[PDB]
Every structure is written in structure tokens, then in C-alpha cells.
Design a protein around this ligand. Sequence first.
Ligand SMILES: [Mg+2]
Ligand SMILES: [Mg+2]
Ligand SMILES: [Mg+2]
Ligand SMILES: [Mg+2]
Ligand SMILES: [Mg+2]
Ligand SMILES: [Mg+2]
Lengths: 195, 195, 125, 196, 196, 204, 233, 226, 222, 212
Amino acid sequence: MDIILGIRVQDSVILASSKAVTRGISVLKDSDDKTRQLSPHTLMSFAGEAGDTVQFAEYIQANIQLYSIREDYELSPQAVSSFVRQELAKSIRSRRPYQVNVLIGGYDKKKNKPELYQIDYLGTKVELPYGAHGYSGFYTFSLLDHHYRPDMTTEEGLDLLKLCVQELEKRMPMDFKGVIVKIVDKDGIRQVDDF
Amino acid sequence: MDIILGIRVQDSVILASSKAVTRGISVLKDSDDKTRQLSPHTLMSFAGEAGDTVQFAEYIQANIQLYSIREDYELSPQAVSSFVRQELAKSIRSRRPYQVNVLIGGYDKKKNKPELYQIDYLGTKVELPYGAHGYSGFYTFSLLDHHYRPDMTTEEGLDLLKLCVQELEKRMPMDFKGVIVKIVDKDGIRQVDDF
Amino acid sequence: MTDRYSFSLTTFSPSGKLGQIDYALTAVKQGVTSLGIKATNGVVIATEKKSSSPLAMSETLSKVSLLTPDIGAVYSGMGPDYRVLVDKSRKVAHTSYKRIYGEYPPTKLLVSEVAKIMQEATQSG
Amino acid sequence: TSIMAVTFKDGVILGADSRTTTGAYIANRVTDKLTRVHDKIWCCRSGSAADTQAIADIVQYHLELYTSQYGTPSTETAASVFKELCYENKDNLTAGIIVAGYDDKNKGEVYTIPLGGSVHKLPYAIAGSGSTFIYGYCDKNFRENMSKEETVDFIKHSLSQAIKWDGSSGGVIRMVVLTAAGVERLIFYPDEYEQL
Amino acid sequence: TSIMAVTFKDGVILGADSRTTTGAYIANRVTDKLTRVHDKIWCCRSGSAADTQAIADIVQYHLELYTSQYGTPSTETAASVFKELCYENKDNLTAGIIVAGYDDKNKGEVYTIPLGGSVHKLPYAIAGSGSTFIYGYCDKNFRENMSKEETVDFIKHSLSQAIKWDGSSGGVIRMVVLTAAGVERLIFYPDEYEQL
Amino acid sequence: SDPSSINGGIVVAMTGKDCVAIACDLRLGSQSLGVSNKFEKIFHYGHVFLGITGLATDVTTLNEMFRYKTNLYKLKEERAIEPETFTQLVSSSLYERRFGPYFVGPVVAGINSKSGKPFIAGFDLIGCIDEAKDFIVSGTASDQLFGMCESLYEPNLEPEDLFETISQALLNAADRDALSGWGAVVYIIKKDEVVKRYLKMRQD
Amino acid sequence: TQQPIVTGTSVISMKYDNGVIIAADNLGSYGSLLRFNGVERLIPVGDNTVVGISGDISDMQHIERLLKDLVTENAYDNPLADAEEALEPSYIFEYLATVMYQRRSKMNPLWNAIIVAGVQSNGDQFLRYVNLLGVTYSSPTLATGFGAHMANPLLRKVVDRESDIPKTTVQVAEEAIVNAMRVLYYRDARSSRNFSLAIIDKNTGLTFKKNLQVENMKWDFAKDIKGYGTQKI
Amino acid sequence: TTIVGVKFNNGVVIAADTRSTQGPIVADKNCAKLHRISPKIWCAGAGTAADTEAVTQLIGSNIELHSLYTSREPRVVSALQMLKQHLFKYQGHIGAYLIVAGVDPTGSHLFSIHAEGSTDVGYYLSLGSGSLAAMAVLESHWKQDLTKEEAIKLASDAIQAGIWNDLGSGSNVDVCVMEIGKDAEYLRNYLTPNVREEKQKSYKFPRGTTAVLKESIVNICDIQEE
Amino acid sequence: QFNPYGDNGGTILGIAGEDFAVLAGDTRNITDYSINSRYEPKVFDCGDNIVMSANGFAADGDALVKRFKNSVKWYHFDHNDKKLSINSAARNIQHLLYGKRFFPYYVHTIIAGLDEDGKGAVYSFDPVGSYEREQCRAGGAAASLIMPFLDNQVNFKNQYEPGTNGKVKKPLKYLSVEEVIKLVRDSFTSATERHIQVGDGLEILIVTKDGVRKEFYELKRD
Amino acid sequence: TTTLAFRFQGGIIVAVDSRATAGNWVASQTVKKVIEINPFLLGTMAGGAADCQFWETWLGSQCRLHELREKERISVAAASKILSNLVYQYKGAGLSMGTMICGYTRKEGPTIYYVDSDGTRLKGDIFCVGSGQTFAYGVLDSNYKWDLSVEDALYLGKRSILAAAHRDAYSGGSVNLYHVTEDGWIYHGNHDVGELFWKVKEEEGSFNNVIG
Ligand SMILES: [Mg+2]
Ligand SMILES: [Mg+2]
Ligand SMILES: [Mg+2]
Ligand SMILES: [Mg+2]
Ligand SMILES: [Mg+2]
Ligand SMILES: [Mg+2]
């Protein structure tokens, strides 16, 4: 799919993902949720080739849920991101690689810290205060570089995110039909239903 | 450029053309007027390859204005459309053809009739009650086939045109930044400044 | 070199006469008599074979020439001018008609083409 | 194609097979590849039939016009005209020509003009697809100042082997003898040369 | 490469040049292309040096194991083993091999195995890039039941011409004689064969 | 990509007893997209009729070109051009673009005004004349038309019988072609009257 | 997938009243080089079948070995190997046709065109074709390669349909075959003068003729032909 | 297409089939492939049909003008030279493959010409997709000193071989005989061995079967007086 | 490069009547511009009152027919000599064809027979196994020449009742076996005239409750 | 090709055209583009005919095995995912498929899944697939409401295919209508486009551009 953004503020991680699903000529859907809850305090957004994106995301979800049941324990965001990276690094030298880029937003309950990980389809992982995939970063990073502070509130993060989306809507040729925004914090994952 | 629409109603011709100019990655402009007045009662909208569109349109404009001065007379919409077709038919077998598609909306003052001509870059001319170029027709023609009447008022034509643009904005992947709408009738050419 | 005579050699005199055309007509007047008669079921053209010498084989000099299978020509005046006009007339019947319409030109139109060639020698440089 | 020209005591003899192929189909089994550009200047053609015919026709025209002005041309002059056409138009031609002629002053001479349009004066020359198979045989068996009968045998035996191994060559062996006595055409049929 | 094998009254003789090229560079000017796969079964190699060496080594192994079990193999058997490798692996091989051997029952025999992996039993065989230039000469000069001295002269003269015209061939002419008397190696240097 | 099948369309012509018929569909398209249902492909210059299939810009261009040429012909000859003569003119005009041709399939139909003989002819894009006694077909459904005409046609049909034959040939051929249809016209041509009929057909 | 290296040209054949005739020249070409001059391309199987093969010679030699093995195998535990349970032309063909189609289906074909000619147990003529694609067909006359283009037209003038077969004698059929071989020698650049011919008759059995030559050739008219247009000398 | 040319005692004969095709479809079932260059010089064309026609008419036109200029009857070698030099110039892009035959004051002649400009002399020749079938017949039955009747028979038999065996050829045999000291006789549809059998059914429709939307008279007449 | 496919030409035609079915095909086999055989049967009786033809590449066509005939034999072995119904045969052929989805049988298959109610049935397949029951279907080289004619003369398309002028369609009255055979013969006679790959002979297999009957007709050989 | 399916108050409407083409040649006008997976589930045909036919019949077999094992009707979610997981295994091999898996169960209600050969599986309210999809979308989007009656919804689906059949060269022949209820689908007949067009033109007043 197209635009996926992430921003780590003081006490939460915010993931914004576009709603459009376009199959060549027509926009087939304008309410698509490009995300999966891997565990109660870990969310993964995704974008890439059709079919592979959801297939990969659900495969990861199943594996993390399996771990959660086996050990009666939630893996840290760092541990989950390392598992995901290895799967993609394994995938890139396969017969047919997963063409999927992901952002992993999680709240580490042990350290009481939000964490954002950016991983591309090659298995290139980086921990960031804010991140994106595709062309999204080209339009938004100059705004994030300017306004971002590590001590921002969730409300300030959402306001900076709105400015990013407005810039995308202005200068991007494609109509991505707005974004679904989700917040990951100590209380878990919730969706901002008005954005 | 992208979307250009035309509709011939009872007493006027209405041309709608998108405002976006996209150069690959960025939308450079969102207020571009993809039209030229060839004579007081003849308007031509255009879309195709960058540079060639405006170059061709202004070249045609200059030629019709030259004719108008020489003869102290306004050529009929039919005569203008035939001149334009020949130029494109000549162009298609040139060293480097004009990659330009046009709609010619004119009000014939002799016959007291509105007239709409659709001409593609090959020099393929057709007189139509409503027309389009590119993918615009794929989204809009089913609506126009249903609602169009030859005795429609200008206000009804604009309402049907709004429904066409709404469908384009819903199902087209590209953001064409709305349309500039112009009306051609017995009193000449005017722009609808709120659409 | 180059043909530096790019101007007309036939021009209007004060009286409105085109001298060179009048003088050409005078040369025609000196020429041997030729005639043509049209019948209901045919046309005849005739002339005298004025042999320049009795040693000359006058059969080798054709004053009456086939232009197309259904068109013939005869002249009075300068023989060499006629011979080249016949060559041009035969060719123009093909290039400007038979190669276009797949049939030989009607008499009046071939005559028109020959006339055009003669007109141009009256105005060209 | 198998073609050759051989100088000998009394002059020069040109030899050729008669097979013209379009792929594996023999389009003409009785082709005449020995072509006259002047009374006692002939040539053997190999490569594109269209090209070598076009070239030969132009040369014949050039030597005819030369003769009208300056008298009989030398074999060297004829070879030079061939070369001029072949070299200057090398990008658009596929022609391998052997030029052979008899002067009274120079006697028998042979010039070969390969693909590039270079000229090489030789005691004898071989060309065409079939020539590859007889480089060994010809080199071992050629002698200078052979008799007419010896040269006919040399060419007959050589082209026999070329025909035997090359599928592109075959049919009859044609020969043209160029001497002071005049121009003599010879032909040799399969039943004759196949048993050699 | 120029290689050949010729049967004669007392057995068979294999002949070869010694030039190995990488493009226009002579990588080895003293190559031994005559290869022993059994005591009195040898072969001439042409094509890919890597392929023909690999094949020959495998054949030698096969005939060594054959001999341990069933005694001395025939030349036909050796040719069959060569063919089996060449035919079954035709997609991945560039090898043109001539197999020559001496039995007491069958005497001198020559088998040629061209690119495709077919087998052809012949009185004599020629192969390699240089062979093209001596098809005419060899066909005209070969006789059955020649003497040892005549066969040596035939091969020496043949490969001399092949070397003369083929840039890929050159160096020394190596020969291996296979008779009831045993195995004799011969070598002939440029100063000898170039003046022939 | 293929210029002769971008716009689509068909023409068919037939001879009858002292009459000829020429017919065409009305579709103009941009590949899959239907653009016009009023694009007539039959034109006439005096009593000579010309149908043209293929690339629509060339159809229009050639019509204008032959109107141009037949108008000058008439001024100079002082008579209307005949079908046999016009056929040669079409052939000449097409071949003069031998290495940059118009992508068209022209069809000539008419009756010689002096002999009264019915005449039809067809051409490839480059000018080769097909002068058939029975029928000529052209367009994106030419295979279908060949099949229809070969079975439906019989010689010496009366004008009103010929109409039914050519109409059914066109209609059923067009209904097996994606790029033909959207209406149809049939001309029935006699020595000094011509009747033009628009046919009712499926609009998909 | 490969390319043919050493190749054999046309195989031609036809039916006549009491049996079949098949013929093929003795050349093994190496591109345009006429390399091998003693190649037998007609291979008899028993006394009732002859298999004619064109195309790649290395694959032909492989097929020759398959047929040799087929005869050995049929004789195993078979007291009627030389009688009621002998190999029929139809058995031999169907086996080859199976192999050819299987090999093309593995994208590794035997690069050949094959004609199986023979006479069945009940006296019926057998003549059927199979090639590298596994394509099979039967006809009163069959020919491969160039033969298909030049021999068939001549042979079809003798036997144009099924009803012409009983009217065609062995002398007329052999004459037609021999003439066709001459025409192919005139016109096929990859043909040779030497050929083999096999007759399988229901009465006289298998007659295999080796070392035949094309004779009665017309070449004399070549002496009059001069230049390529305007040349007189 | 199958075309042949055959020399005989006192002249030359050319023949051709009458099928023209677009791919696998038969465009015309009775095509005329024998073209006239001049009254006694005829040729048959294979390849691109427009090219064979156009090149014939051009050289035929120039041959006529040449004949008038020189006061001599046209020669086959002139037609040959003009054809080959034209075709050579266009490097085979004009896809004309011709068999040129005729009689003139020099005698009777038979040539072939390939699209790239190469020419050929022969007593019997054939061209086209059915040339191999035709040449098989010619090579089997041709002899020196054929009579007029024998040559016509041989030529038409060679065309038949193409008609029956070559899918690119069919329908009828056209023949033209050019004899020395005589008018060339063009024998259109000399043989007709492919007449279609009567159909099982008549497909004439009842009148009023076709649905009609509109009728109108078309004005083919000029603007009228009064 | 080796091309595993070829084109053997040919044209086939299946028509379903009220209580019968016909499957017809020309007997000409070709490659390029040459004729391989003037009589090479293309329509086959496969047992259980089913006739079949796989037109296109003849090697794949022969292979498919052979495997289907084999499937009929094993259906009898495995299911107590039960008669293979035409609908069951059709589904079975889909699986044979789709089994080679990624290296297809390069053929257009048609089978004909009677359904379990005794009514005429024709099934049509694409190369990879998509199929449908149809009333009328031509296949192969001249299919585009034949189908429009059948639309007009079997289904009476574009034909209206005289006097009504387009308001009342010509009623779809049932055709007899003699009537169908006339249309088949005229279809192939017309196809022979205009298509170079069609000719030599026409073989028709007619299926009724009484069994399978054959009819042969000469076609032009040029 | 033009296929559509949309959810509404009374269940699901499925509407398809009937045309199949090979290039410009119209191979068939009587193609069945609604695959009856079982009495409760429908699938649409677009892309590859064989791929859709074969694998959606196969899907029916898997659905039958599910309900035999689980003694319960398979959900539309589960049925669609069996198909999407299958085609995803073949991804890259060249399968061509664009289908709507349509059903109406107790737990889900009326449900439509767009399943596609590159592995896409989308739940939605309105889907339209094929060469004429854009034309049908126009009519759908401007007239669609959740509270459509079964009668009006059936007509809307019919009218949308007609719109596509008219403009799209590769769509036409006839219209097939289905209404999917909780108790199973109901077939609502075959409608020849030729006859339907004139009928709709007159009764509706639409298509004034076309002369009738
Ligand atoms: Mg060239
Ligand atoms: Mg290797
Ligand atoms: Mg050396
Ligand atoms: Mg249509
Ligand atoms: Mg034929
Ligand atoms: Mg449509």
C-alpha cells in the first residue's frame, strides 16, 4: 500500500496509516486498516506488495500470540522487532521474498518507555523517534526534524502528525483517502476515531 | 495533464478541466487553467504531454486570432475544429508529433446552437453531446448516459457535471485538485468561480 | 555558368503585343500546310512530307505522331520544336493521367497539358 | 559457391560451379557465375547475387565508356573500378569478386577483391564458400606457367573437391579461357568430374 | 587445432599440431593433443580443452576398470564409452574426439565422434578448425593399405597445409604410431614440414 | 497498438441485379471504450460510393482527400468520376504512401452511368485492388463477414432482396466483434435512385 | 533443448497395391559441409518393417539402438517371437510415437522426423509419420523435410487417394520414388546422389536395396545458358 | 502463389494460379496474376501484390514511352534491366518477385527476378509459395524442343501441382502464350477445376426480416435548375 | 530455441439438437503451407455414447483424447461399469486440462452426446479447462467464419417476423438432424472457400439414443 | 467482463455480464460468470475463466468438507480465506483471478470478500471487477443506499451491468442476476442486453444519445 507514518512521543507511540486500497485503475476501498496488533502493547503497521503485506502481518501476529500463550508473557517491543527483522532478512534471500515494509510501535512495560522500530523488506532495522516508509518521509521529515521534541505529549504528537498529513495531501499526487491513527501506550492500543 | 470534460446542453457548452500540474513526485500547482479562448464564442481545453499542450493550444489560438483579424469575422466552431483536426492529423506523421488531446466547445452564432467537438492527438474528430479524454470517460460516461437530456438548462448541466466530478474524486487514484469550469454560450465565455 | 537568364524574354510592348508570340506565329505561317477534318465516325489529319533532299529517307521523318492509342498530332512550323513537344506530350499523358487513373487522357485534357507547356515557354525565364 | 581464376603460360582461365541456393533450396542449378565486363576481362562472382550483378553491370558500363575514350583498358584498371565500388560502398555490399583478364603486354593477370574492398594481385585466386575446402589442395598442386590442358585439369580437380564437400556448390563446372587466340567457353558435367 | 587419424597396412597413426589459443594469444605452443586412454587405444582432442581432458580421464578410468575385469577392450568399446559421455552430456560439452586403436584381431581402426555425440567408423578421420582446409587434399591423397612411411608422409603433408592456413593451428606436428610392434612417438619441427 | 484495430468498424459491399449495396457499422472507439455511435464510414462523390475502415483519423483524412480530388476531376473532365476510374485513383493514392501508409481498408461501390454495370472493389492499406464479382469485406470483423457473405450471398438478387442479405451479413458479423456495432447503415444503389437505411441492432 | 548437429535430409515413402516403399539418401551433413557419405538412414526391424529417419544423426543412432533393444526384449520368454507374437509395424510406430511425445514434453526432444513403413500380419499396408513434437499422421504418400515439398506432389500424382492404392503396382511405385529422389538431388542442397531404397511386400517380403544412384540426369541444357540477362558470350 | 515460365520451340509460355490471400484467409478466389508489361512482354508476380502490380505498371509505362521514342518494339532485356535497377535501389523493400517472359525482334526470352534485384536465365522457372511443387513437375517432365501444346500442358500441370499441394495457391490456372511472329494470346481461366458445389440450402431471406429505424433518399444528382 | 507447440490447422463444429447431437470436423492435417494428410480423422467415438475432438496442436489433441478414452475405461473398472454421463465426462476433462495449467494442451476441445434426460448436449473447453454446456460451437481455424452464420441460421439472431418490423422475433423452432447436417455441410463448404487450412473432407459423427453413426463428405482439395 | 456485488438491507445483489472475448473476437455471449459454490455461497468470474471455475468449484468441495467435520455452515470469512490462501501459494506462477466471494450467515450477516490472484483479500460493501468496472461503479455509487428494497436493488445491479455492457466493448451478451439471502441465493434470470437496452431506454428515458 502507500503511506505509513510513526512518531514516538514522551509516553506513547502513534502510528498513522492510509486508508486507500488501489488496484491499478480504481480505488477499491477507502477504509482499509493497514495494521495488526501483535500483543496488547505492540502494534505493527505495514505497506508493500498486495497479498504479501497481510500474509506477512498475520503470520507475525500468529507467531507472537503463540509465544505469548506458551510463556504467559508479553515479549518486549525490542524482542518482537528483532524477530520480525530476522524473518524479513531470511525472506530476502528466499525463492520469492516478502515485499513488505513495517513500522513496529510498542510500549515497553518493563522500562516504561515507548519505542518505534522501522524495518524495510530487506531486514534493515532502525529504532527512531519518528519514521516512515516509501515516499512518506520525503514530505514529512523536514516538518518532524523542525517540530519534534522527545518530551511531547500525545496531543502535541497528534497535532504534528496532522501537519504532516496536510503536507502529504497538498504535495502528493496520489489520493490516499486520509489516515487511520492509533496510539500505543501503557494502557494498550486505541484508535483515534476522528482525524 | 489529466481530466478534461465537456457537456453540450440546450443553449451552451460547459468545459470542466482539472487544476493539478504534477511533475513526477510533487504537485507543482493546484490552480492551472488548461484552456485557451480561440475566439469570443469558441473555447478549447487540452490535455497531454508537458510543454506540447500549451505550445499547441497557443499556436492554434494565434492562428484563429489571425484569421479573425484578416477577415473581420469569427469562424464557426465546426470550421475551427476542422482546422485543429488537420493540424493534429498533420502532426501525427511528423518527426515529433504533438501529444495533445483537445475538446472544442463553441456557440455557433449563425445557427444559434452550442457545439462540442472531441479531438485526440491522432486527429480523430467527433461531435458529441458530452465527451472526455484519457480515463475521465471511463468514470463519467455511465452517469452522462443515464441523466443527459438535449434540452437541459445550464444549471442542470452543472449539476450533472458535479455528480461526474464527485465520482471521479471517489474512484480515481490521482488527486487532480478539483476542476475549473467554463461556460460557452451566445454571450461568450465565462468562468464559474465557485465549484 | 548557371542559367543566369531568370527573366522573361517575352514581354508586352507599348501597343499590348507580345512580340515573341507574334514572331512564333510568323514562323508557323512559313511552315508547310497541315490540316484536320472531323467526320461523324472519325477524324483525319494530313500534311505534306516536304523532303529536304531526295537522298533523305522521308519515311524516317514522322510529321504525324501517335500521342496515345486514341490521339494523334500533326504540326506546321519548326520541326525540332514539334519533335520535343511530342516527347513531352507522350510523357505527360502518362505522368499526369495514366499513372493516376489507369487510363489514357481524353483529347481535350491532353491538349490542355500541351497548351500549358507552350504557355510556360511564353512566360518562364 | 566455388570460384577460381588461374594464370598460365598462354593467359588465364576462370572457373566456377553453377549452384545458387536460397537456404537449402537450390534456386538455380545452372547459374552462370563467369561474367563478362570486357572482351578479355571477365570476373567470378560470390556473395549477394543482387550486389555482384549490380557491381558487374556498373563496371561493364565504366569499361565500355573507358574504351570509347581511351581504348582497351588493362586488367589492373578493371580491378581498380571493381575495388572503388566495393570499398566505398562496403557498408551496403556483400560481394567477393575475382577479376581475371588477358592483355598482350601483361598477358594473364588475376586480382581478388574480398569483402572489405581490398585488392590483391595473385598468380591464382580461390573464393566462395567452397574454396575453404581446397586451400590445401590448390596450394600443393598449383604451378606457374602450366599449359592450357594442365590448368583445365587443375581447375576441374579443384572445383570437383569444392563441390564434393560444399553443399552450397554444385551443378556443372563452367570455365572461360582467356588467351591471345580469343575467348573459349568450357563446360563439364557431374558424370565427368565426380569420378575424378 | 588440426588433428587426424589414418589406418594403414600395419595398424593406425594419430597426428596432431601443438597449438592451443586463447583468442589470438597462443597459450601453449607445445601442447600434446594425442592422449592415451589405453595401451594401444589413443585419441585426438578438439574443442574445449577442459571438456576433452575431463572426458578422456573418465574414459581412461572406465577402460582401466574394464581391463581389470574383462581383459583388453576393443577400439569399438572405447569409442562407445566416449560416445556415451559425449551424447548424454551434449548440452554441456564442446568436444570433437577422434578415437584410434590397434587390436590384433581387428587391426587398425578409427572412430570419429563429432559435436553431437554420434559415432562414425572411417578408414581415416580429420577434425579441428584446421581440418576444413585439407578435405580436398586428404580425399585426393588417401589410399587404403599404405605403408608406415607413406602414412607418415600423408599425415605430415596434410597437417602441414592445415597449419599453413589455420591460425589456430601450429607448432610441432606430433604423431603416435599404433601397430603390433608397439607404440612409437614421432615429432616433426617447423623447419622440416614448412618446406614441404 | 495495431493501428487498424484501435477504432474498430466494418464495411461490406455486394452486387445484385442492376444494383449494388454498401453497408457499414457506426462505432468509433478508443480500444475498449466506445466513443461515438454516429461515425459513418461510407461517403460518396457523385454516384460513386466509398466505404473506409481502419484508423479513424485516416478515414476522415482520405474522405477529405478524395472529395478534394474528385472535385478537381469534375471541374477539368466536365463529368462525374466513374467507379472503375475512381478505383484506380484510390489505388494510386494509397501506393504513393508505400512506406508510410494510411492504415485503412477502403471499399468502392457504384454503377457505371454509361454501361449500367454494377461495380465493387476492395483494397489493402497499400493499394492492391480486389475486384470481386460477388462481395467485398473490410474491417475488424472481416473474417466474420467472409463467413456470412460466402454462405448468404447468391448472384442476381433484386434490390430489396439484396438489402436483407447484406443487412444480415453485417449485423451478425458485427455481433461477433467487440469493436464493431453500435448501429449500422445500408445503402441500396440503383442507376438513378439511392436509398439509405439505418438498422436497429443491439447496443453492446 | 538442443540444436541438431550432424543431420540427414528427406525420407520419402508411398503405398502401393501389395505393400509400401521407403527411401532416403546416404548423407550425414554438418551444416553446409557434406561431411559423412556412407550413412544408412533406413533401419529394418525384423522382416516386416523399415523405419526411415531424418534430422539429427546422433539421435537417430540412439533410436536405432532402442529398436535393436526392442527386438531383443520382444524375444524374451516368447516362443512365438518369430511368428504370431513378432513385432508389428504398428507396435514399433506406437512405441516411437510415445517416446517422441514424452521427450518433447520434457523439453528435451529427439530432433528427428520419422516414417515407419511396413506390412501388418493381415497383409495391410502400414505407413505413418512421427516427429520431434510427437505429431503423427498417415497418408498414401509420406515425406519429411524437403521431400514433403517436392516428393509428395509427384507421388500424389500416382496415388492421389485411398482408391488409387490397389491400382498402383510395385514397378510404377518404385519408378515414382526413384524419380522423386532424382528431383530432390537436383534441388536440395543437403542431398546426395547415393541412396537406399526398401520395399516391404506382403508376398515377396522385405527387399532392401543399398548403394543406389541417381541416374538419367539432364544437364546438357546448361551449355546454352549464359550470363544473368544481357550477356551473349 | 504459384507462377511458372516455360520456353518452347518458337516462343515462351507463362502461367499462374488465381488465389490471393491475407494470412490464412482467401481475399480473392479469381485473382489475375499475369500482368502485361507490353503487348508481347508479360510477367507473373509473387510476394507483395501491390508491389508486383505497381512495379509492372511503372516499367510498363516507361517501356511504352521508350518504344515510342525509339520507334522500336520493346525488348524483354529492357524490361528486365529497368525492373532490376529499380528493385535493387529499394534493397528488397519493394517485395516484387517476378517471372518475366516475352517475344521481341531479338527472339523469345524467359527471366526471373528476385525482390532485391538479382536476375536469372532459364528454360523453365517457377516462383511463389507453390514453386517447389511446380518445380518438381517441371524437373520431371521438361525436355528440350517442346512444342507449343506440350509447353502449355507442362506449364498448367506445374500450376496444378501448386494448386493442389500448396495452401497458398488455389482456384484456377491462367496462361499466356507468347509465340514468335504472332500476337500473344492471354488465356484467362484456362483451367477451372475448383467450381464450388451447389449449397444444400438457399439463404434468401423473407422481405421485412431486417429491422429498420429510418429510410431516406440519397441525393447523388448535382444541384438542379429552376 | 525449441518450440514444443505447433499448429495442425483444422476446424470442428458441434451442434446439439432436441434428441440428438452432431460433432463434425474436416479431415485435413497441415503444417504451415503444406498438407500432411487429406484424411486424418479428428473426431472420435470415446465410448458411452460420447464423441470428442481436441482441435489445434495435433500431438496434444491425440494425447488428450487418448487419456480421456483411458479415463472412460477406468471409470468402468472403478464404478461397476457405470455409464459415464456427458456432464461427468465434461467435468473429468476439465481436470485433465487443468492438470497441465502451466504447460497446457494447446487445443480447443469439444465433446458431444446426450444428457441424462435424452436431450442433445455439447460441451466446449478452452486450453486450460474452463468449460460450458452450449447449443452451438465451432472450433479451430475457421471458427470465426462459421459462428456468425450459426447465430443467424440456428438461433435466428437479427431475424424478425415480416410485417412487424423488429417488434416480433423469428420464433426458435427446433431443427431436425437432416436440417442440422445441411447447415454443417454449408458451413464447411463456405469455410473451405475462404480458409486455406479447411478442405479435403468432412467427417460428421451423429449421436442418438441408438448410438453413434458416421457420415463423410468430400470437400475441395485446393 | 463486468461483475459486481453489493451489500444491502435485504442481503447481497450479484450481477454479471455474459461476454467472453479472445482479442477482438467474441468467443461467447452465454458465459456464466457467477459460480454457484454451494446453495449459500456465490463467486464471480473475472481474469482467468479456468482459474475461477476450477478453484471456486474446489472451494465448494472444501466448504462441504468443513461443514461435514464441524457440523456447522462455513463462514464467508473462512470460505474466502481458503481461496485466498490457496492462490497465494501459487503467487508468481501466473494465475489470473478477480472474484467476489458472497454469502449471508447468522454470525456475519451479508458479507462480500474481494479475493484476487496476487493474494489480496478485502471485505467490503460494494465491489466491481472487470474491463467495464468503472462504468458500473458510476451507476452504483450515485444510486446506492443501504435501505434499498430487494426489487430496486436487483434493478440497480441490472442497470449497472447494462451501463458497462453499452460502453465497454468487452462486456455484453446478457445479464445474470442473483439475490443472496440467509437461507441461500435466489436466481433472478438471464436478461439479453440487446432487448434490455431498448426496454430500459424507453421506460427510463436514458441513453438519449442513442437513436431507437
Ligand atoms: Mg544489400
Ligand atoms: Mg563446459
Ligand atoms: Mg599457423
Ligand atoms: Mg460488437
Ligand atoms: Mg492449395
Ligand atoms: Mg459492449
